[PDB]
A paper describes a structure:
We report the 1.8 Å crystal structure of Cass2, an integron-associated protein derived from an environmental [name]. The structure defines a monomeric beta-barrel protein with a fold related to the effector-binding portion of AraC/XylS transcription activators. The closest homologs of Cass2 are multi-drug binding proteins, such as BmrR. Fluorescence assays demonstrate that Cass2 is capable of binding cationic drug compounds with submicromolar affinity.
Structure determination by x-ray crystallography revealed the protein Cass2 to be a monomer organised into a barrel-like form comprising an antiparallel β-sheet of eight strands. The topology of the domain highlights its pseudo two-fold symmetry, which is based on repeating β-β-α-β-β motifs. The central cavity enclosed between the helices of Cass2 is largely hydrophobic in nature, and aromatic side chains predominate. However, a single acidic group (Glu134, originating from strand β7) is buried deep within this cleft, flanking the pseudo two-fold axis of the protein structure. The polarity of this side chain is stabilised by hydrogen bonds to side chains of Tyr56, Tyr136, and Trp111. Between the helical edges of the cavity and directly above the topological switch-point of the sheet (i.e. β3/β7), density is observed corresponding to a polyethylene glycol (PEG) molecule captured during crystallization of Cass2. Hydrophobic side chains from helices α2 (Trp35, Tyr39) and α3 (Pro104, Val107, Ile108, Trp111) and the β7/β8 interstrand loop (Tyr136) are within 4 Å of this ligand. In our structure of Cass2, the site occupied by PEG correlates closely with the location of the cationic drug-binding cavity of BmrR. The loop segment following helix α2 in Cass2 appears to be relatively flexible in our structure, and it is thus feasible that access to the ligand site in the gene cassette domain might occur by a similar helix-opening mechanism, perhaps coupled in this case with expulsion of the interior side chain Tyr39. Despite being a single module, Cass2 retains some of the hydrophobic features of the interface, as well as possessing protruding charged side chains, including Arg149 (as its C-terminal residue).
Author numbering: -6 to 119, 123 to 149
Write the structure that this text describes.
C-alpha cells in the first residue's frame, strides 16, 4: 500500500469543539461510488470553509450520532476547531468529549492513506477493546499524515 503505518496507541484525549458541514450516511452508501456522500461533503468544505481557515486551524472528520453500530447510519462532519457556526453558513458546532481512545496513525498519499487507515481500524476491532460508538474522528494532522481516534468503552 506504500504507506507508513505508524501503529496504534491507547490514550486519554482532551475534548474539543469543532464546526463544519454534516451529512448523514451509511457504510453501504459510501461503498457504492454513485451514492457516496463523504467526497461531496469534503468538496463543500474545500469550497465554503477552507478559505476561512488559518495556519493554526486543525481539520477533522467526525463520525458521530450513530444510529446503532457500524451497520447503521451515522453523521459525518467535515470541520475545524477555528470555524464558528456564524463565520460559516449552514454549519453545525459539535463538542467532542474527553475520553479513552485507540488512535491509529499513518502517512502517505492523501486520501489513499485515510482510506487504508480505516482498514487497519476494521481489522483491529474485528480484540482488547470495544467501540463506544459515541464520537470517532479523523484528524488531518498534516498534508500526508492522518490519525483516526476511535472512542472505546
Amino acid at each position: 500500500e506504500n504507506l507508513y503505518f505508524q501503529g496504534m496507541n491507547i490514550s486519554e484525549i482532551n475534548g474539543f469543539e469543532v464546526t463544519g458541514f454534516v451529512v448523514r450516511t451509511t457504510n453501504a452508501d459510501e461503498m457504492n461510488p454513485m451514492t457516496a456522500k463523504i467526497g461531496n461533503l469534503w468538496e463543500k468544505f474545500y469550497l465554503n470553509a477552507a478559505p476561512k481557515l488559518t495556519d493554526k486551524s486543525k481539520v477533522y472528520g467526525l463520525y458521530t450520532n450513530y444510529e446503532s453500530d457500524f451497520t447503521g447510519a451515522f453523521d459525518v462532519i467535515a470541520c475545524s476547531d477555528t470555524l464558528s457556526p456564524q463565520l460559516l453558513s449552514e454549519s453545525v458546532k459539535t463538542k467532542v468529549s474527553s475520553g479513552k481512545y485507540v488512535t491509529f496513525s499513518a502517512t502517505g498519499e492523501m486520501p489513499q492513506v485515510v482510506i487504508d487507515l480505516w482498514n487497519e481500524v476494521w481489522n483491529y476491532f474485528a480484540c482488547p477493546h470495544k467501540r463506544a460508538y459515541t464520537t470517532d474522528f479523523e484528524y488531518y494532522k498534516s498534508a500526508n499524515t492522518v490519525e483516526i481516534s476511535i472512542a472505546v468503552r
